A paper describes a structure:
[name] is a small (89 amino acid) protein that localizes to the nucleus, at the NE and in the cytoplasm. [name] dimerization allows for its binding to LEM domain proteins and the Ig-fold domain of lamin A/C, while each individual subunit can bind dsDNA. More recently, [name] was found to play a direct role in repairing ruptures of the NE by recruiting LEM domain proteins and membranes to the sites of rupture.
In order to further characterize the effect of the [name] mutation on [name] 3D structure and binding properties, we initiated a structural analysis of [name] [name] by X-ray crystallography. The only interaction known to directly involve alanine 12 is the interaction of [name] with the Ig-fold domain of lamin A/C. Therefore, we determined the 3D structure of [name] [name] bound to the lamin A/C Ig-fold domain at 1.6 Å resolution. Only slight changes in the relative positioning of the [name] monomers, as well as in the structure of some lamin A/C loops (especially at Ser433-Thr434) were observed. Despite an apparent similarity between the 3D structures of the WT and mutated complexes, prediction of the binding energies from these 3D structures using the PDBePISA server suggested that the [name] mutation changes the thermodynamical equilibrium of the system, with the mutant binding with a free energy ΔG that is 1.8 kcal/mol less favourable compared to the WT. Also, both [name] WT and [name] dimers bind to a single Ig-fold domain in the crystal structures. In addition, we noticed enrichment of PLA foci in nuclear blebs of a subset of control cells, indicating that blebs could be a site of increased interaction between [name] and lamin A/C. Together these data show that the [name] [name] mutation reduces the affinity of [name] for lamin A/C both in vitro and in NGPS cells. Here, we demonstrated that, in the presence of [name] [name], lack of A-type lamins accumulation at sites of ruptures does not affect the dynamics of NE repair but leaves areas of the NE devoid of lamin A/C that are more prone to re-rupture.
Numbering used by the authors:
A (entry chain F): 429 to 546
B (entry chain C): 4 to 89
C (entry chain A): 2 to 89
Write the structure that this text describes.
Amino acid sequence: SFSQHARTSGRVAVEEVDEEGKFVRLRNKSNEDQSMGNWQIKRQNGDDPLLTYRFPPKFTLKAGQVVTIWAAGAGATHSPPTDLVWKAQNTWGCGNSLRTALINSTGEEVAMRKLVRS
Amino acid sequence: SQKHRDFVTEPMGEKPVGSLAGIGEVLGKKLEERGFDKAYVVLGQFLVLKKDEDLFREWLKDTAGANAKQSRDAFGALREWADAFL
Amino acid sequence: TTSQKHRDFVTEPMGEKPVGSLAGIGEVLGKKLEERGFDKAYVVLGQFLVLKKDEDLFREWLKDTAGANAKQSRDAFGALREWADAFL
Ligand SMILES: [Cl-]
Ligand SMILES: [Cl-]
C-alpha cells in the first residue's frame, strides 16, 4: 500500500509511522540517552496544513528506548517515558504522502520517515 | 526491482553506482571510468539537468551506453529518491 | 561566524529553495548562477556532487561560472558539505 523512506542523522529514528494515523514511534538507536525537551514532530500530509507535535520541556529518551506519540483518538493513555498522548490532536492525518520528521528544539531536522501511497 | 526498493527507501550515502536501479555491471564500470563511481555522482548529474527525464536518460545512453529500460529505471529510482530525501 | 543563511540551509532538506538560500550566494552571484541554469540550490548541490564533493574543484567552478570571491566560495562549499553530511 505505502512505500517507506527513512533517514536518521542522529541518535533517534522515526522507527514506525502508523498508516491509520494513530501514532508515530521513535527509537533511540544509540548507546547514549537523548534529551528531547521542546523537540518537535512535523507531520506533512499531502498539501494539508502542517501539524506539529511538541515534546514536553523536559523529556529524555534513554539509550535503546522507544517512545510512542499517540493521537488523542487512538484510545491510548499518557504513560511516560514510553507513551505520550498528543492532547490537541485526534489523528496524525491521512493522505497519499505522509511525511513525519523529528526536529530538535532549534529547528534542525534530525530524522524522518515518509510514507508514499503506491 | 529489488535494487530499486533498496535504493529509494534510505539515504544513498557512499553507495556505489551499481546500487542504483538500472545500473548493471557493464553500465556501472563505464560510469566508474568516466568519474561516476558512486550513486551520489549520478544523483548530481540528475540534479544539474534539473531532474529532466529526456536529458538525464539521453545523458546515461550517451555517456555509458545504457539502453531504454536501464535509463528509465535509473531515472525512476533517482526521481523517487530525490522526492523523499532532497 | 556561520551566517543566518548557512544555519537556515544546513538544518533542513533544501527541496525547491532558490540558489540564493545557499550560504555565500549573494544577489549578484545568485543572478549569475540563475543565468547559467543554476536556479535552485539543488542544482549547485548537483554540481558539488558531480565534482565528488572536492573543495578546490567546487570553489574554482563557482568562481569561473559566476564570479564568486574566495569568501563566497568557501561559505557555499561549507554549507553544501554540511548539508550533504546530514541529508545524503
Ligand atoms: Cl520508455
Ligand atoms: Cl551568507
